[PDB]
From a paper:
The trimeric spike protein is a major membrane surface glycoprotein of SARS-CoV-2 that mediates the binding to the host receptor ACE2 and subsequent viral entry into cells. The matured spike protein contains two subunits: an ACE2-binding S1 subunit and a membrane-fusion S2 subunit. Extensive structures of the spike trimer reveal the open and closed conformations for the three RBDs within the spike trimer, where the open “up” RBD conformation is prerequisite for ACE2 binding. Upon ACE2 binding, the spike trimer undergoes conformational changes to expose the FP motif of the S2 subunit to initiate membrane fusion that allows the release of the viral genome into host cells.
Residue numbers in the entry:
A (entry chain A): 298 to 620, 640 to 676, 690 to 736
B (entry chain C): 27 to 70, 80 to 142, 157 to 176, 187 to 210, 215 to 297
C (entry chain C): 737 to 828, 854 to 1078
D (entry chain A): 981 to 1127
E (entry chain B): 737 to 785
The structure:
Amino acid sequence: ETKCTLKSFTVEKGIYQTSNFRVQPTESIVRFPNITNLCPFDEVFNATRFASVYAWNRKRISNCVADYSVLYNFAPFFAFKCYGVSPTKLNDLCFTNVYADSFVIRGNEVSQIAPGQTGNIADYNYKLPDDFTGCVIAWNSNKLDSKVGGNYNYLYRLFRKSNLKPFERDISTEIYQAGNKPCNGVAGFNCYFPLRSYGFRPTYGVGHQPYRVVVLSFELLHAPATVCGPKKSTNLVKNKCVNFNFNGLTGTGVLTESNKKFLPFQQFGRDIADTTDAVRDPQTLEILDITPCSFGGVSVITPGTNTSNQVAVLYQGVNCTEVSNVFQTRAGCLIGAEYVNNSYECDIPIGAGICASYQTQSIIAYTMSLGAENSVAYSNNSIAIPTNFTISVTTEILPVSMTKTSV
Amino acid sequence: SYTNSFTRGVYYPDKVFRSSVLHSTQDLFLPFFSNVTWFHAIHVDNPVLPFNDGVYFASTEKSNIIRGWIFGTTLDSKTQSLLIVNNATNVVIKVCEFQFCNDPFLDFRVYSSANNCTFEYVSQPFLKNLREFVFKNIDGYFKIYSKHTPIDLPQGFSALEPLVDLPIGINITRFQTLLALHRSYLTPGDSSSGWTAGAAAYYVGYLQPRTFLLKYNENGTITDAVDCALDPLS
Amino acid sequence: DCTMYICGDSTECSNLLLQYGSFCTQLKRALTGIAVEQDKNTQEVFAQVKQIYKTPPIKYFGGFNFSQILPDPSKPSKRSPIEDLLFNKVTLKFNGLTVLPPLLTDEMIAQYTSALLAGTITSGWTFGAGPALQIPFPMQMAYRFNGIGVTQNVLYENQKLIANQFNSAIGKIQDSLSSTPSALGKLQDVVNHNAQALNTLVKQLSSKFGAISSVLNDILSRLDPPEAEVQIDRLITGRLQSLQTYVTQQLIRAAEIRASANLAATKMSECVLGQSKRVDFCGKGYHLMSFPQSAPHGVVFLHVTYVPAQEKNFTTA
Amino acid sequence: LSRLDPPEAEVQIDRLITGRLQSLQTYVTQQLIRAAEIRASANLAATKMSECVLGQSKRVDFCGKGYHLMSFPQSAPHGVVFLHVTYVPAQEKNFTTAPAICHDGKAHFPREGVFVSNGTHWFVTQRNFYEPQIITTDNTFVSGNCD
Amino acid sequence: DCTMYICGDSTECSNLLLQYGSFCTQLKRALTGIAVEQDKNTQEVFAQV
Ligand SMILES: *[C@@H]1O[C@H](CO)[C@@H](O)[C@H](O)[C@H]1NC(C)=O
Ligand SMILES: *[C@@H]1O[C@H](CO)[C@@H](O)[C@H](O)[C@H]1NC(C)=O
Ligand SMILES: *[C@@H]1O[C@H](CO)[C@@H](O)[C@H](O)[C@H]1NC(C)=O
Ligand SMILES: *[C@@H]1O[C@H](CO)[C@@H](O)[C@H](O)[C@H]1NC(C)=O
Ligand SMILES: *[C@@H]1O[C@H](CO)[C@@H](O)[C@H](O)[C@H]1NC(C)=O
Ligand SMILES: *[C@@H]1O[C@H](CO)[C@@H](O)[C@H](O)[C@H]1NC(C)=O
Ligand SMILES: *[C@@H]1O[C@H](CO)[C@@H](O)[C@H](O)[C@H]1NC(C)=O
Ligand SMILES: *[C@@H]1O[C@H](CO)[C@@H](O)[C@H](O)[C@H]1NC(C)=O
Ligand SMILES: *[C@@H]1O[C@H](CO)[C@@H](O)[C@H](O)[C@H]1NC(C)=O
Ligand SMILES: *[C@@H]1O[C@H](CO)[C@@H](O)[C@H](O)[C@H]1NC(C)=O
Ligand SMILES: *[C@@H]1O[C@H](CO)[C@@H](O)[C@H](O)[C@H]1NC(C)=O
C-alpha cells in the first residue's frame, strides 16, 4: 500500500500516510414516529347498509395515516383492479385526499365500474374518469343484502337525457320525457319513471345478486400531503456506530444516551459547527448523543526495502481499544513495534515525543533523547581556561535561484 | 394609545436544539423598541386590524375574560375565516364560510346567521398574568407561539414556544378580540356593550423580516437576542 | 481528507472524484509538507545546544536571583514560574479534519530551555561555541560590561546595587506581564487564525453550491442516477474550490510562521548564546544577556538592558 | 468536436476550460509562494555571503557554529555552499580565578584577560588561550582600594 | 464589497450569494487584516524614537 501511494518500488526510510481507517456500520435503524389515525377504512368496507348506485355514498379521507393493508380481511375480491397504480405500491405514495365512493350493483354490472367501459350503470348513475388513478374493489353481498320477499330498497337510474360526467351525481326523480308529448308528472306512454328498483332475492344466481363495490380515488393536488402510509423498525442500538434515520434526520454514528435535556417542541440538536450532536427518539422520550466511532489515519513507518521489509502501522488520533505489539501513545497508537525503555537518538518521528528505528531485528519505539547529560561545577573561585585550538570546517548549503518556467 | 415593546417579541425560529451557542437567522420577528398599539381603553370599535406579517398579541387579562380570536380574509359571505374559540376545558379551531358582524361576542354561541364551517382541528385547551402570543402564516401553516409568564411588558426576557401547528393557506388580513362579560347583548350591529369587568387590553404589533442573533444556553432556552438593523452596536 | 471532506460516505462520489485529477494527492502532499516544516521550526531555535546542562544545587550565583526563570522541582511539570504564568494565558476529526500533535511536547521544550538557561548562566557564551567552561556569574557580568565599553570596575564595586536592580526588574516583569492581558497577542493571533480557518471549512459544507441540497444522502435519494451527477459534479467542484483556497492560505501562513521562526532562531543564537553589538536586535538599549522561556506556541526572550541615567553637563575638548 | 454538435459541445467546452483554468490558477499561486520562499532564501544567502565571505562577523551562529574566522563560497547548479572556518577551544583546564588584586592598599584590575592561579601563584592571561604572564603594571590598572 | 462587486443592485442576485456562505466574510476579514498590517509596518521603522 505504501508503494501504491508513493507510486514507486524502492521506498525509503520514514513514515508515510497511505489511507484512512473507517469503521463500517453493521446494522441500520429507522425509528420514525408511533402509528396513529388509521384512516376510517373499516367503516366504509364494514358498514351496516350501503347506498344506491345513483346515490353512491362518498367519504373524504384526509389528515390520517392510510394503512391500505387492512383491505385483506375482506374475502377474495372479484376485482381489486388498481388502475394507474400497483396493488403493492399504494401503501407508500403520500396523497392529499383519498375519496371513497361505495355503492351496490348487480353482479353483471360490476365490470362497468372502470374507465372507458359503458353500459347502463356508468352512463347515468356513476361514471369514472378516463384517467382515473385509483383502485376499484368489488365483493358479493348476498347473505347481507338479500331478502326472501325482495329487497326493493336499492334503486338505480335506467333513463336519462345524456350521460353523466366524471364523478357526477343525479338524485332527481322527474319523469323521463321520452317523446314529444310533454309529461305532466304522470307515468305512461313515452313518460316512464327513471329510477327502478332491484329485486334482490336469495334465489338469484351469481350475476344478479347484490355486489358491493367501492372505489378509492387518490388526489395529488399541489396542496401538502396529509394522508401518508405507515413506516417503522425497532433498534436503539448503543456503543456501536450504525445508520440512523430518526424522523428524517439521517446519519451514521454511535447512538448513546445522554443528559442534554431538550425543550418539548424540538426534535434534534446541533453543535457550534452546525453538525448534529443529539436527537429525540421518536418513541421513548430520551435524548441520545450522536458521536462518530473510530476514525483516523493509518501511517506505515517503513525502514525502507534497502534494510528489510518489516513495517509497522500507526493509527493517528484514535484510541485502538477497538479495531504485533499494541501500544498506545499520545499521538495515536502503533502496532508492530515494541516500546523500549532506553532513550536513543530520534530517527523516524511519530508524534508527542515518540520515535521509531531499527535496532538490529524489529521496529522499536522509544522516547527521543534531547541530548547527553553534563553538569558543570559552578564555583565563585573556579574557572575553565582552554589550552588547545581546533580549526574546523562547517558546510552550509543554501538555495539561490529556481527553474524559470513558462506556460 | 401607543407604547413601546422594549425587549419582547422573540420566539424559536426552528425546531432545532443548541447548547450555549449563538444562532443568527433572518426570520419574521418583532422589532425591538418598536411602537405597538396599546388598545386598553377600547371597550367594544375599529376592528380593522391587518395581518400582513402577523400579529404580536400581548395581554394581562385577569381570568378568562377573553373568549378567543378570529382570523379571516374579509369577513364576507363564503370567505374562509378561522375562529379559535377557547372554552374552559377545550378549544375549538374551525374555519367557516360566513359573513361575520362587527364585534361577534361570546357569553352568542352562534356568531353569524348563516354559519358554514368545514375543518376539524381539536387540540389542548389554551385558555402578573402575562399571556404572550405571536401569530403568523407561512408555508400554508397558520403558526402560533404561546407563552404564559407572570409580569404591562416588563424588561425581562422570555421566549415564545411553538405549541400548535395547523395547515391552512388563505389571505389572512383580519384580526379582532372576543371579550366576555355579564350583560348579554344579542344585537350584532350595536357596538356598545361596556360592562364593569377587569382590565382588558389587546396588544397589536406587526412583525417585520429582520435578522436576529439568539443565544442558546446549556438547556436550550433563548435567554438573549440582538437585532441587526437598529442600533449600530447591535 | 480529500475523499471524506468532499464526498461523505458515498462510493459513487468517490468514483466521480478520481476523474477530477490528482488534486487529492497534491492537497494532502502540500499539507504534510507544511506539517514537516512546522516540525523543523521548533528545532532550529530550541535544539541549538547538543548536551543538556543542569543548574548546580547551591542557589548562590553571586547575589542575583534566578528563581523565576529556573525550573521549579515542586510542580511535577518542570517549568519556571514565568513559564507557568505564560502557559496559563494561551487559550487553545470533524468531517475529515484532524489536528496532528507536535513531536516535541511542552516538556522537552522546557528541558531545552532549562539547559540553555543553565548554559548561559553558568558557562556564559562558551556553551554555544564549543566546550562549556565554568565561570563565576559576576565575572561573566564583568565580561559583558567590558564588551560594550563600560569598565569592569563599576560592576566589581557596585555589585550589590546591580544585583538589587536585576532582582527588582525580574520581580516586576511578572507584574508587567500580568497587567496587560494582550501581551501574548502574537501567540494568540496565530491560534485564533488557525481555529477560524479550521472552522470555516465545516460552515461552508452546509452551502448547496448550486444544488438543491447539501448532503449527498438526500441528492442520492430524491433524484435519479444521471440527473444527480451534474449536481454531484457541482458539489464536488464547490467543495474542492473551498479546499484549494484553504490550502493556499495555509501555505501562506506556514511561510509566515517559517520566517518568524527563522528570525526567532537568529535572535536566540545572537542574544541568548552570546552578546551582540546590534542596537535593537536583543532589546532596546545596550544588550547584556538574554534568557529564553518556552510557550505553547512560541518563545519569550527576556533581554537584560543596561541604560545610562542621571546624566550631567560637562565641558569637552 | 467530432461526436457532439456545435451548441451541445459548448457547455462541455466551457466546463473543460473552467477545469483547466482552475488547475492553472492554483499552479500559478503555488509558483508565486515558492518564488517568494526562494527569494527570502536568496536574500538570506546573500546576507550570509556579504557578512561571512566578504569579511569577518561577530555573530554567533551566522557564519558557522563557534568562532567564525573566514568563509569560502562554492557554486552549485541551484545554490551556494559556504565553507566556514571555525576556531574552537579545546583541552580546557581548571584554574582559580579572582576579580582583582589588593596590593599597596590599592585594588588593581587586569587590563585584558583574568587573574589565573594554579596554587600559591598568580598570573594574567587572555580569555581564549592559556598564556601565563607575570602580573605587571602594563597589563593591570588601579581603580581604588580593596574595600 | 462582495455584494456590490458580484451582485450589483440586484436583491435576487444577493439572495443567491448568501447561499455560498462565509466566502465573503473570510475575504473582507483578510483584506482588512492586510490593511491593519500595512498600518503597523509604518510604525516599526519610523516610530522607533
Ligand atoms: C409507542 O408505543 C409503545 C407501545 O405501546 C409505547 O410503549 C410507547 O410509549 C409509545 N410511544 C409514544 C410516542 O408514546
Ligand atoms: C541502500 O544501501 C546502499 C549501500 O549501503 C546505499 O549505497 C544506498 O544509498 C541505499 N539506498 C537507499 C534508498 O537507502
Ligand atoms: C484509551 O482508552 C482507555 C480506556 O478508556 C484509557 O484508559 C486511555 O487513557 C485512552 N487513551 C487515550 C489517551 O486515548
Ligand atoms: C518501561 O516503563 C514502563 C513505565 O514505567 C513500564 O510499565 C514497563 O514495564 C517498562 N518496560 C521495560 C521493558 O522496562
Ligand atoms: C563563595 O561564596 C560562598 C557563599 O557565600 C562563600 O562562603 C565563599 O567564601 C565564596 N568564595 C569566594 C570568595 O570565592
Ligand atoms: C409612537 O408613534 C406616535 C405616532 O405614530 C408618536 O406620537 C409616539 O411618540 C411614538 N412613540 C414612541 C416613543 O415610539
Ligand atoms: C365548556 O365549558 C363549560 C363550563 O365549564 C363546560 O361545562 C363544558 O363541558 C365545556 N365544553 C367543552 C367543549 O369543553
Ligand atoms: C528570589 O525570588 C523569590 C521569589 O520571588 C523570593 O521568594 C526570594 O526571597 C528571592 N531571593 C533573593 C535572594 O532575592
Ligand atoms: C544642561 O544645560 C542646558 C542649558 O542650560 C539645560 O537645558 C540642560 O537641562 C542641562 N542638563 C543637565 C543634565 O543638567
Ligand atoms: C574540574 O574539576 C571538577 C570537579 O572535580 C571536574 O568535574 C571537572 O571535570 C574538572 N575539569 C577539568 C577540565 O579538569
Ligand atoms: C604554576 O605554573 C607556574 C608557571 O609554570 C609555575 O611557576 C608554578 O610553580 C606552578 N605552580 C605549582 C604549585 O605548580
